Write a protein that binds this ligand. Structure first.
Ligand code: HEC
Ligand code: HEC
Ligand code: HEC
Ligand code: HEC
Ligand SMILES: [Ca+2]
Ligand SMILES: [Ca+2]
Ligand SMILES: [Ca+2]
Ligand SMILES: [Mg+2]
Lengths: 308, 308
């Protein structure tokens, strides 16, 4: 009778220097064509790792196609992106940099930008052995930093570890309903999700104008239409709005929809209130580190093109 | 012992908690209508306090009218903004929040946004005795945070304080050229500028397509046309491009232009490189603090409007 959910464990970077280099790159807006957009712009670590809007604002204020997921605990995902088209964090990181709808630069340009700065070259030398800058090393460093973005210490985890007073009566009943109703069928493990692909709209379809088809984009099979990676519910309190289209503005709405179309279960108001209370106890310790200080661009650095 | 420039000294917040609150607000993108733009977006503290582009990107990617100045050491300015229309940091902070070309929100909405969060209400109470949030308290807190954004410790300051080795041969000669040519007429004091309004184009006009008129926008006196607050040269190495229109991409170009139109001095390539070397020794210790962790928006919080 072991719990369907396990505590998140603290992480010690295999390569501290690499994680520091990755941190810097994650906050460097010069990886973008505009010199205005960094990974942190859309995955704000001061706010829970997302941009907290329906879909992401990209280069020249392009309205993105889908809701940006949190990077927090993303190292635990079975694959990356809503349709899992990316195998891991490293592969994922190369995407946004060259995505015309997001950072809109190119791997070639990103390499030249970083390499133009002596302070970055020195770090690549320390970390990789030589001062050569490549998108491969860049994504490897960012990935290492993201591995450290886990959030242990949530009240629920403290309860799981034996602290009976970490949860109040409503929160405990919420968890019991979460488990008893069937939510754990898909939202389980340390991340309370992120370990499989499931249909969004089991008993009834999810109503949305958003055209995303999920896994079908990868397989082309009709059976995969509307099948997405199950999101982690850790820090769900900080990652509103909800669902891939950002269609559910509140947790209550997300829970009611989930109960209704995934379990054919209409929760009453108090039941929803208790589950939501439980979900908020899944918020863990947020990133704790100094604001990164980045090296200045110099006369050799390709200049930003915010309006060009 | 009587150099025209004096060292910058560390600043301990009169109210530590107030500065901590100001720090959180400075990094909060919810002060903007889009929920995507914070003070840090255009005054990036990881990069030197500016956005490092010709003019600022505002709501819906509006191309701003003028180059964004650095907030670093801004507490030393005789007034705020290129035309000095704002008397101090407190007064200045109210501008961007309600500027349709920048954050595009309103003072009323920002107050409602911040007050909707218990975590913020609690901080305002421990700071101002009361838990109610007003644009007055918001700007007071931000200004307090900005008072701490001074940058002591630059190599030049170490030199002024006794370390004869803090500067190399070229850097020292550069300083001597700076002092001996007439530059300290306008760039002096602890901020190496910021203490007066001066004409941009003393001997010859500064060519630019930018329509900014400077002090005339405030005084209406034709005599004040093209008269601006002299920018601080502290951390000038980190705040490219240069001048109010962002027209000079390099320090070499900026120095050459300044000598020509301000002093009627034509510096040869060697002299320019030495002055540039000196300017870089004005880069001080950058902000050293933990990345702010902000409270989550809740069901009572006005929702971000990035596209509507
Ligand atoms: C907005 C303009 C973005 C920028 C800049 C970056 N990311 Fe992002 N990211 C964004 C979206 C809309 C999505 C989902 C896209 C999809 O097709 O599903 C993502 C996804 C990720 C993920 C996947 C996490 C998951 O649970 O699936 C990761 C790990 C991630 N993003 C990391 C990341 C990094 C490191 C970035 C900078 C190099 C970066 N993103 C920029 C939107 C935006
Ligand atoms: C599989 C059959 C699921 C069951 C059972 C439950 N959930 Fe779920 N959930 C699942 C998926 C595939 C998704 C993403 C759907 C999409 O296209 O957006 C979700 C998402 C949520 C969310 C939002 C997460 C986010 O947007 O980041 C919440 C809050 C959530 N699910 C809660 C939840 C609860 C409380 C459940 C039972 C009542 C439940 N889910 C069951 C897949 C499945
Ligand atoms: C970009 C869209 C901006 C945002 C967001 C904020 N600021 Fe800004 N700031 C910007 C510009 C283009 C200018 C100059 C405007 C002019 O007419 O001169 C400024 C100026 C300041 C200053 C004055 C510094 C000086 O004159 O030397 C300060 C102190 C400053 N800005 C602070 C500040 C704060 C605290 C913000 C958020 C509430 C903020 N700015 C946002 C562009 C942008
Ligand atoms: C007043 C009569 C000045 C003298 C003498 C010098 N400078 Fe200056 N400088 C002055 C102003 C009013 C401005 C802003 C002009 C504008 O409209 O943009 C500046 C700016 C600079 C800068 C750029 C600062 C920035 O963009 O933030 C630099 C690097 C600079 N000045 C250097 C400099 C040097 C080396 C001088 C002597 C050769 C010099 N200035 C003289 C006003 C005055
Ligand atoms: Ca979300
Ligand atoms: Ca500048
Ligand atoms: Ca010039
Ligand atoms: Mg020009």
């Amino acid at each position: 009778a072991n719990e369907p959910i396990q505590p998140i464990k603290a992480v010690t970077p295999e390569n501290a220097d690499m994680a520091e280099l990755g941190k810097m790159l994650f906050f460097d807006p010069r990886l973008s064509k505009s010199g205005f957009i960094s990974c942190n712009s859309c995955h704000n670590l001061s706010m829970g790792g997302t941009d907290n809007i329906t879909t992401s604002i990209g280069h020249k204020w392009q309205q993105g196609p889908i809701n940006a997921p949190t990077v927090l605990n993303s190292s635990m995902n079975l694959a990356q992106f809503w349709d899992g088209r990316a195998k891991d964090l490293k592969e994922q990181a190369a995407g946004p940099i060259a995505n015309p709808k997001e950072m809109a630069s190119t791997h070639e340009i990103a390499e030249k930008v970083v390499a133009s700065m002596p302070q970055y070259r020195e770090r690549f030398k320390k970390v990789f052995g030589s001062d050569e800058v490549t998108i491969d090393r860049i994504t490897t460093a960012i990935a290492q930093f993201e591995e450290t973005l886990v959030t242990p210490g949530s009240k629920f985890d403290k309860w799981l570890e034996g602290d009976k007073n970490a949860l109040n009566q409503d929160e405990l009943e919420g968890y019991n309903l979460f488990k008893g109703s069937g939510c754990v069928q898909c939202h389980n493990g340390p991340a309370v999700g992120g370990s499989s692909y499931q249909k969004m709209g089991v008993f009834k379809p999810y109503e949305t104008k958003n055209p995303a088809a999920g896994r079908m984009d990868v397989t082309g099979n009709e059976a995969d239409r509307n099948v997405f990676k199950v999101p982690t519910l850790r820090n769900i309190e900080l990652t509103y709005p909800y669902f891939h289209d950002g269609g559910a503005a509140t947790l209550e709405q997300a829970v009611e929809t989930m109960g209704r179309i995934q379990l054919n279960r209409e929760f009453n108001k108090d039941e929803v209130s208790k589950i939501v209370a439980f979900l908020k106890t899944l918020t863990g310790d947020q990133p704790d580190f100094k604001l990164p200080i980045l090296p200045p661009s110099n006369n050799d650095t390709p200049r930003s093109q915010p309006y060009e």
